[PDB]
Amino acid sequence: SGFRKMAFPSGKVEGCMVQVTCGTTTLNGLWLDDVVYCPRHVICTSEDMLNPNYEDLLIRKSNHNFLVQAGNVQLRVIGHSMQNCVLKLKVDTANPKTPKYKFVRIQPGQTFSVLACYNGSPSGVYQCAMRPNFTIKGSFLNGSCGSVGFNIDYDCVSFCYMHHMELPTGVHAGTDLEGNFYGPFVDRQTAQAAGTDTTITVNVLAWLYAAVINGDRWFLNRFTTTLNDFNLVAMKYNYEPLTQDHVDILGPLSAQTGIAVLDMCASLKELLQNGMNGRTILGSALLEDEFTPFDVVRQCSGVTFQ
Amino acid sequence: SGFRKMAFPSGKVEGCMVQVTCGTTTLNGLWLDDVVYCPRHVICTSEDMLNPNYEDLLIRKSNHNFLVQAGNVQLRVIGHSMQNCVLKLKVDTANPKTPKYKFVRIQPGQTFSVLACYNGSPSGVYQCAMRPNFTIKGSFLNGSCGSVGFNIDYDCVSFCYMHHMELPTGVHAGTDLEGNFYGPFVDRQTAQAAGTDTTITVNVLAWLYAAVINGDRWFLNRFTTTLNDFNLVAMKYNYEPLTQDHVDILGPLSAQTGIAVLDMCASLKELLQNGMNGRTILGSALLEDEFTPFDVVRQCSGVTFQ
């Protein structure tokens, strides 16, 4: 019983975090085998960030311009290259703590755990979602750049996010581990801003199923809806359209609870039109959209990771 | 920027989790040096739990009745003893991954991270508080018993909770790592239930300071209050009394924001009397009480742990 925002255990990632310094900038890097991955903006001065040419800036660097520190041990940089917006520093030592891992580019609406780090040292772990507008609502202070997001599948760490910057509204932008930004953002000082966001409908529905599993049904009703009629309401409330693929994904939760997907859609429609009337669901007075269907099944069924 | 429920990095604890089996019961244990700690109810059958005499049950056990598995490796039990409600199994191997650690009994209102585990394998990490009624609102399924709660201070893991059971309302009860229950609970099947709970006032105030730090002031007002007058309202809303020691603890957040503690109390009083009027604070439509003053300072200032 119970339902909490739950992160993956972070130990496999903690053993990969290092500090990278270039000039006056220190940030975090990810050490896997004999390569350290970090944001390429580590090579920039503040003046560079107005309109940097990274190819031109990087060709001017030498290996000894990069200081990599793993705990109390300096790693010697022996090569470097740039892949999109990620810098890859080849070091003379393979990380003995490298876990099984893969790099994965996620879709909006997916969740992941973040290990927030400063000066190469982990500070905390929390759970996030990739918003529809390709930002994350993280918790990051100065020096957090290079911190990573991940999921774990059995024993395999799937890295999906590296933190690059904070946008004017206080939300965060970053890349996959191959250096491609999520969203339209660039690693340059411009007027770029988060676009209008929407609520992740399939996730709200998953969380309503979690609430039923945990023994609360107050928000259910006797109605159903068509997919098309539900999406008319969703659009009105700035919710993402619900697709047939989303309905299919919710199949297992529907089967476990005995509540047809479109019947749960009718309950969400009534919640959107009438509000929660001072009631709560799973300890929240608003509709929560940062649990995926997979997250609900994992927490309500008890999957582990060795 | 940002503010999330943030757990401590769990790697130091992951390396301590093992599986303990006695008869038909399997649960989790904590392996530190050459001792495994677990709930003593592992020795009970379901019939035993109605009215167990643990001294009488344990004297009948042999070392070979306890199966301890660390990953794929069996640890041989070479002795056992009971301390309050915790069983201590001496094993023939010291855990090479034992971190620096201490055992600490916490006060109600304090927070800690939980590493939820099943069959000795970590599943997830989340942040909890010890409620005033000495329960926790965890997320635990069958097999989670023996999972632990902890805080980290520099490099030292302070263990403060071991999970023992779920109460009828779905909340959770357990012990310190020396086997003493929090609250009046016992490791026997009885009619025991959670008492009435209250809201942790000093934590709500800390979270309002976090909101101001992150740039939101909508709920502030021009009023102040006396400590005594505030506590009259707190009692009416089922909030814990605010003590002078709590005011002192909030000193640093007050100094950083320029908002006197009793002025923040006047804002909380107005929030209790008028509600939030459809507004949110730090993404919540209710007043959050599971962040301590220390938690706020850590997340808004950026402390790490090596």
mmCIF file with all atom_site columns, N, CA and C in Angstrom, chain A residues 70-114:
data_model
loop_
_atom_site.group_PDB
_atom_site.id
_atom_site.type_symbol
_atom_site.label_atom_id
_atom_site.label_alt_id
_atom_site.label_comp_id
_atom_site.label_asym_id
_atom_site.label_entity_id
_atom_site.label_seq_id
_atom_site.pdbx_PDB_ins_code
_atom_site.Cartn_x
_atom_site.Cartn_y
_atom_site.Cartn_z
_atom_site.occupancy
_atom_site.B_iso_or_equiv
_atom_site.pdbx_formal_charge
_atom_site.auth_seq_id
_atom_site.auth_comp_id
_atom_site.auth_asym_id
_atom_site.auth_atom_id
_atom_site.pdbx_PDB_model_num
ATOM 1   N N  . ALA A 1 70  ? 38.146 12.310 -10.464 1.00 0.00 ? 70  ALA A N  1
ATOM 2   C CA . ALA A 1 70  ? 37.247 11.256 -10.023 1.00 0.00 ? 70  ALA A CA 1
ATOM 3   C C  . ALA A 1 70  ? 37.590 11.018 -8.558  1.00 0.00 ? 70  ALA A C  1
ATOM 4   N N  . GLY A 1 71  ? 36.722 11.459 -7.662  1.00 0.00 ? 71  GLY A N  1
ATOM 5   C CA . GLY A 1 71  ? 37.069 11.423 -6.246  1.00 0.00 ? 71  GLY A CA 1
ATOM 6   C C  . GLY A 1 71  ? 38.299 12.279 -6.001  1.00 0.00 ? 71  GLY A C  1
ATOM 7   N N  . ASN A 1 72  ? 39.339 11.677 -5.429  1.00 0.00 ? 72  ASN A N  1
ATOM 8   C CA . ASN A 1 72  ? 40.597 12.366 -5.180  1.00 0.00 ? 72  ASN A CA 1
ATOM 9   C C  . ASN A 1 72  ? 41.650 12.071 -6.236  1.00 0.00 ? 72  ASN A C  1
ATOM 10  N N  . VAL A 1 73  ? 41.265 11.455 -7.349  1.00 0.00 ? 73  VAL A N  1
ATOM 11  C CA . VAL A 1 73  ? 42.207 10.977 -8.350  1.00 0.00 ? 73  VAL A CA 1
ATOM 12  C C  . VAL A 1 73  ? 42.018 11.786 -9.619  1.00 0.00 ? 73  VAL A C  1
ATOM 13  N N  . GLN A 1 74  ? 43.107 12.350 -10.130 1.00 0.00 ? 74  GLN A N  1
ATOM 14  C CA . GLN A 1 74  ? 43.077 13.007 -11.426 1.00 0.00 ? 74  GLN A CA 1
ATOM 15  C C  . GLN A 1 74  ? 43.166 11.961 -12.528 1.00 0.00 ? 74  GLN A C  1
ATOM 16  N N  . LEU A 1 75  ? 42.277 12.065 -13.512 1.00 0.00 ? 75  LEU A N  1
ATOM 17  C CA . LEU A 1 75  ? 42.345 11.265 -14.727 1.00 0.00 ? 75  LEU A CA 1
ATOM 18  C C  . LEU A 1 75  ? 43.004 12.093 -15.821 1.00 0.00 ? 75  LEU A C  1
ATOM 19  N N  . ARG A 1 76  ? 43.961 11.488 -16.519 1.00 0.00 ? 76  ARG A N  1
ATOM 20  C CA . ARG A 1 76  ? 44.672 12.180 -17.580 1.00 0.00 ? 76  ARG A CA 1
ATOM 21  C C  . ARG A 1 76  ? 43.865 12.090 -18.865 1.00 0.00 ? 76  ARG A C  1
ATOM 22  N N  . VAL A 1 77  ? 43.589 13.244 -19.460 1.00 0.00 ? 77  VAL A N  1
ATOM 23  C CA . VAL A 1 77  ? 42.905 13.300 -20.746 1.00 0.00 ? 77  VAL A CA 1
ATOM 24  C C  . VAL A 1 77  ? 43.912 13.057 -21.859 1.00 0.00 ? 77  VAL A C  1
ATOM 25  N N  . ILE A 1 78  ? 43.605 12.097 -22.732 1.00 0.00 ? 78  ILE A N  1
ATOM 26  C CA . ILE A 1 78  ? 44.485 11.702 -23.820 1.00 0.00 ? 78  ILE A CA 1
ATOM 27  C C  . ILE A 1 78  ? 43.872 11.922 -25.195 1.00 0.00 ? 78  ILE A C  1
ATOM 28  N N  . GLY A 1 79  ? 42.625 12.359 -25.269 1.00 0.00 ? 79  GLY A N  1
ATOM 29  C CA . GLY A 1 79  ? 42.023 12.713 -26.541 1.00 0.00 ? 79  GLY A CA 1
ATOM 30  C C  . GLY A 1 79  ? 40.693 13.368 -26.256 1.00 0.00 ? 79  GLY A C  1
ATOM 31  N N  . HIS A 1 80  ? 40.152 14.016 -27.274 1.00 0.00 ? 80  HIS A N  1
ATOM 32  C CA . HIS A 1 80  ? 38.841 14.616 -27.121 1.00 0.00 ? 80  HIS A CA 1
ATOM 33  C C  . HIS A 1 80  ? 38.181 14.710 -28.481 1.00 0.00 ? 80  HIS A C  1
ATOM 34  N N  . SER A 1 81  ? 36.859 14.680 -28.463 1.00 0.00 ? 81  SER A N  1
ATOM 35  C CA . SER A 1 81  ? 36.060 14.902 -29.648 1.00 0.00 ? 81  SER A CA 1
ATOM 36  C C  . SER A 1 81  ? 34.715 15.441 -29.212 1.00 0.00 ? 81  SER A C  1
ATOM 37  N N  . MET A 1 82  ? 33.985 15.964 -30.168 1.00 0.00 ? 82  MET A N  1
ATOM 38  C CA . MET A 1 82  ? 32.678 16.546 -29.940 1.00 0.00 ? 82  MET A CA 1
ATOM 39  C C  . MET A 1 82  ? 31.669 15.750 -30.745 1.00 0.00 ? 82  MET A C  1
ATOM 40  N N  . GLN A 1 83  ? 30.559 15.389 -30.130 1.00 0.00 ? 83  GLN A N  1
ATOM 41  C CA . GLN A 1 83  ? 29.429 14.735 -30.798 1.00 0.00 ? 83  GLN A CA 1
ATOM 42  C C  . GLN A 1 83  ? 28.210 15.597 -30.515 1.00 0.00 ? 83  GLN A C  1
ATOM 43  N N  . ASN A 1 84  ? 27.702 16.309 -31.513 1.00 0.00 ? 84  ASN A N  1
ATOM 44  C CA . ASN A 1 84  ? 26.581 17.240 -31.285 1.00 0.00 ? 84  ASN A CA 1
ATOM 45  C C  . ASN A 1 84  ? 26.974 18.178 -30.142 1.00 0.00 ? 84  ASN A C  1
ATOM 46  N N  . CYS A 1 85  ? 26.179 18.286 -29.085 1.00 0.00 ? 85  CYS A N  1
ATOM 47  C CA . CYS A 1 85  ? 26.465 19.208 -27.991 1.00 0.00 ? 85  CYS A CA 1
ATOM 48  C C  . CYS A 1 85  ? 27.162 18.543 -26.795 1.00 0.00 ? 85  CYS A C  1
ATOM 49  N N  . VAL A 1 86  ? 27.687 17.325 -26.941 1.00 0.00 ? 86  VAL A N  1
ATOM 50  C CA . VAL A 1 86  ? 28.423 16.645 -25.880 1.00 0.00 ? 86  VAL A CA 1
ATOM 51  C C  . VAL A 1 86  ? 29.897 16.568 -26.246 1.00 0.00 ? 86  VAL A C  1
ATOM 52  N N  . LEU A 1 87  ? 30.746 16.855 -25.285 1.00 0.00 ? 87  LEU A N  1
ATOM 53  C CA . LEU A 1 87  ? 32.171 16.676 -25.391 1.00 0.00 ? 87  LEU A CA 1
ATOM 54  C C  . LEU A 1 87  ? 32.517 15.303 -24.819 1.00 0.00 ? 87  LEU A C  1
ATOM 55  N N  . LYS A 1 88  ? 33.359 14.569 -25.522 1.00 0.00 ? 88  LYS A N  1
ATOM 56  C CA . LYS A 1 88  ? 33.811 13.248 -25.113 1.00 0.00 ? 88  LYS A CA 1
ATOM 57  C C  . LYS A 1 88  ? 35.311 13.324 -24.889 1.00 0.00 ? 88  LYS A C  1
ATOM 58  N N  . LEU A 1 89  ? 35.729 13.151 -23.655 1.00 0.00 ? 89  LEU A N  1
ATOM 59  C CA . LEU A 1 89  ? 37.120 13.194 -23.262 1.00 0.00 ? 89  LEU A CA 1
ATOM 60  C C  . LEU A 1 89  ? 37.599 11.761 -23.080 1.00 0.00 ? 89  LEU A C  1
ATOM 61  N N  . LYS A 1 90  ? 38.553 11.330 -23.903 1.00 0.00 ? 90  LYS A N  1
ATOM 62  C CA . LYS A 1 90  ? 39.153 10.019 -23.698 1.00 0.00 ? 90  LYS A CA 1
ATOM 63  C C  . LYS A 1 90  ? 40.191 10.158 -22.596 1.00 0.00 ? 90  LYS A C  1
ATOM 64  N N  . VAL A 1 91  ? 40.113 9.281  -21.603 1.00 0.00 ? 91  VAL A N  1
ATOM 65  C CA . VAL A 1 91  ? 41.022 9.302  -20.465 1.00 0.00 ? 91  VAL A CA 1
ATOM 66  C C  . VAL A 1 91  ? 41.832 8.012  -20.457 1.00 0.00 ? 91  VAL A C  1
ATOM 67  N N  . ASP A 1 92  ? 42.917 8.019  -19.683 1.00 0.00 ? 92  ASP A N  1
ATOM 68  C CA . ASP A 1 92  ? 43.848 6.895  -19.724 1.00 0.00 ? 92  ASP A CA 1
ATOM 69  C C  . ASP A 1 92  ? 43.437 5.725  -18.834 1.00 0.00 ? 92  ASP A C  1
ATOM 70  N N  . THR A 1 93  ? 42.270 5.790  -18.181 1.00 0.00 ? 93  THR A N  1
ATOM 71  C CA . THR A 1 93  ? 41.815 4.741  -17.277 1.00 0.00 ? 93  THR A CA 1
ATOM 72  C C  . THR A 1 93  ? 40.352 4.450  -17.555 1.00 0.00 ? 93  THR A C  1
ATOM 73  N N  . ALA A 1 94  ? 40.005 3.169  -17.666 1.00 0.00 ? 94  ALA A N  1
ATOM 74  C CA . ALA A 1 94  ? 38.614 2.770  -17.781 1.00 0.00 ? 94  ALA A CA 1
ATOM 75  C C  . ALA A 1 94  ? 37.991 2.756  -16.385 1.00 0.00 ? 94  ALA A C  1
ATOM 76  N N  . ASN A 1 95  ? 36.761 3.234  -16.285 1.00 0.00 ? 95  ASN A N  1
ATOM 77  C CA . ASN A 1 95  ? 36.093 3.263  -14.984 1.00 0.00 ? 95  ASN A CA 1
ATOM 78  C C  . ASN A 1 95  ? 35.801 1.843  -14.513 1.00 0.00 ? 95  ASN A C  1
ATOM 79  N N  . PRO A 1 96  ? 36.402 1.377  -13.411 1.00 0.00 ? 96  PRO A N  1
ATOM 80  C CA . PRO A 1 96  ? 36.127 0.001  -12.955 1.00 0.00 ? 96  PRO A CA 1
ATOM 81  C C  . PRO A 1 96  ? 34.707 -0.190 -12.467 1.00 0.00 ? 96  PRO A C  1
ATOM 82  N N  . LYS A 1 97  ? 33.995 0.898  -12.191 1.00 0.00 ? 97  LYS A N  1
ATOM 83  C CA . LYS A 1 97  ? 32.620 0.839  -11.742 1.00 0.00 ? 97  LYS A CA 1
ATOM 84  C C  . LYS A 1 97  ? 31.613 1.037  -12.873 1.00 0.00 ? 97  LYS A C  1
ATOM 85  N N  . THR A 1 98  ? 32.041 0.967  -14.119 1.00 0.00 ? 98  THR A N  1
ATOM 86  C CA . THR A 1 98  ? 31.124 1.146  -15.237 1.00 0.00 ? 98  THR A CA 1
ATOM 87  C C  . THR A 1 98  ? 30.032 0.083  -15.163 1.00 0.00 ? 98  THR A C  1
ATOM 88  N N  . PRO A 1 99  ? 28.761 0.459  -15.116 1.00 0.00 ? 99  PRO A N  1
ATOM 89  C CA . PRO A 1 99  ? 27.688 -0.540 -15.132 1.00 0.00 ? 99  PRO A CA 1
ATOM 90  C C  . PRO A 1 99  ? 27.377 -0.929 -16.568 1.00 0.00 ? 99  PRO A C  1
ATOM 91  N N  . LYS A 1 100 ? 26.564 -1.974 -16.716 1.00 0.00 ? 100 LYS A N  1
ATOM 92  C CA . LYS A 1 100 ? 25.928 -2.207 -18.009 1.00 0.00 ? 100 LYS A CA 1
ATOM 93  C C  . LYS A 1 100 ? 25.062 -1.003 -18.343 1.00 0.00 ? 100 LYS A C  1
ATOM 94  N N  . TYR A 1 101 ? 25.179 -0.497 -19.563 1.00 0.00 ? 101 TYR A N  1
ATOM 95  C CA . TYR A 1 101 ? 24.453 0.710  -19.880 1.00 0.00 ? 101 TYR A CA 1
ATOM 96  C C  . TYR A 1 101 ? 24.110 0.822  -21.357 1.00 0.00 ? 101 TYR A C  1
ATOM 97  N N  . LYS A 1 102 ? 23.140 1.688  -21.641 1.00 0.00 ? 102 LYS A N  1
ATOM 98  C CA . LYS A 1 102 ? 22.818 2.100  -22.996 1.00 0.00 ? 102 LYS A CA 1
ATOM 99  C C  . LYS A 1 102 ? 22.440 3.576  -22.971 1.00 0.00 ? 102 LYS A C  1
ATOM 100 N N  . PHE A 1 103 ? 22.540 4.211  -24.132 1.00 0.00 ? 103 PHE A N  1
ATOM 101 C CA . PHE A 1 103 ? 22.100 5.584  -24.304 1.00 0.00 ? 103 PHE A CA 1
ATOM 102 C C  . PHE A 1 103 ? 20.792 5.529  -25.087 1.00 0.00 ? 103 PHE A C  1
ATOM 103 N N  . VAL A 1 104 ? 19.760 6.227  -24.595 1.00 0.00 ? 104 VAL A N  1
ATOM 104 C CA . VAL A 1 104 ? 18.407 6.184  -25.162 1.00 0.00 ? 104 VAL A CA 1
ATOM 105 C C  . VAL A 1 104 ? 17.833 7.594  -25.229 1.00 0.00 ? 104 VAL A C  1
ATOM 106 N N  . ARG A 1 105 ? 17.250 7.951  -26.380 1.00 0.00 ? 105 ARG A N  1
ATOM 107 C CA . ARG A 1 105 ? 16.560 9.221  -26.524 1.00 0.00 ? 105 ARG A CA 1
ATOM 108 C C  . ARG A 1 105 ? 15.066 8.986  -26.270 1.00 0.00 ? 105 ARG A C  1
ATOM 109 N N  . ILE A 1 106 ? 14.524 9.655  -25.286 1.00 0.00 ? 106 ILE A N  1
ATOM 110 C CA . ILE A 1 106 ? 13.159 9.387  -24.839 1.00 0.00 ? 106 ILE A CA 1
ATOM 111 C C  . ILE A 1 106 ? 12.173 10.312 -25.542 1.00 0.00 ? 106 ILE A C  1
ATOM 112 N N  . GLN A 1 107 ? 10.877 9.921  -25.512 1.00 0.00 ? 107 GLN A N  1
ATOM 113 C CA . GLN A 1 107 ? 9.758  10.713 -25.983 1.00 0.00 ? 107 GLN A CA 1
ATOM 114 C C  . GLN A 1 107 ? 9.225  11.606 -24.864 1.00 0.00 ? 107 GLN A C  1
ATOM 115 N N  . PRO A 1 108 ? 8.572  12.706 -25.224 1.00 0.00 ? 108 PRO A N  1
ATOM 116 C CA . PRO A 1 108 ? 7.882  13.517 -24.228 1.00 0.00 ? 108 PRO A CA 1
ATOM 117 C C  . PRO A 1 108 ? 6.819  12.691 -23.553 1.00 0.00 ? 108 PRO A C  1
ATOM 118 N N  . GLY A 1 109 ? 6.696  12.910 -22.253 1.00 0.00 ? 109 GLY A N  1
ATOM 119 C CA . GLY A 1 109 ? 5.784  12.174 -21.409 1.00 0.00 ? 109 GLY A CA 1
ATOM 120 C C  . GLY A 1 109 ? 6.443  11.047 -20.651 1.00 0.00 ? 109 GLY A C  1
ATOM 121 N N  . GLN A 1 110 ? 7.621  10.607 -21.075 1.00 0.00 ? 110 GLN A N  1
ATOM 122 C CA . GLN A 1 110 ? 8.381  9.608  -20.346 1.00 0.00 ? 110 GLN A CA 1
ATOM 123 C C  . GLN A 1 110 ? 9.016  10.227 -19.107 1.00 0.00 ? 110 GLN A C  1
ATOM 124 N N  . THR A 1 111 ? 9.221  9.392  -18.097 1.00 0.00 ? 111 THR A N  1
ATOM 125 C CA . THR A 1 111 ? 9.826  9.780  -16.834 1.00 0.00 ? 111 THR A CA 1
ATOM 126 C C  . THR A 1 111 ? 11.222 9.186  -16.719 1.00 0.00 ? 111 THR A C  1
ATOM 127 N N  . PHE A 1 112 ? 11.991 9.757  -15.792 1.00 0.00 ? 112 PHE A N  1
ATOM 128 C CA . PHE A 1 112 ? 13.355 9.290  -15.536 1.00 0.00 ? 112 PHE A CA 1
ATOM 129 C C  . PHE A 1 112 ? 13.782 9.842  -14.192 1.00 0.00 ? 112 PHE A C  1
ATOM 130 N N  . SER A 1 113 ? 14.794 9.207  -13.622 1.00 0.00 ? 113 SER A N  1
ATOM 131 C CA . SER A 1 113 ? 15.406 9.688  -12.393 1.00 0.00 ? 113 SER A CA 1
ATOM 132 C C  . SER A 1 113 ? 16.596 10.572 -12.698 1.00 0.00 ? 113 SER A C  1
ATOM 133 N N  . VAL A 1 114 ? 16.763 11.635 -11.918 1.00 0.00 ? 114 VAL A N  1
ATOM 134 C CA . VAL A 1 114 ? 17.883 12.550 -12.024 1.00 0.00 ? 114 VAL A CA 1
ATOM 135 C C  . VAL A 1 114 ? 18.750 12.424 -10.792 1.00 0.00 ? 114 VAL A C  1
#
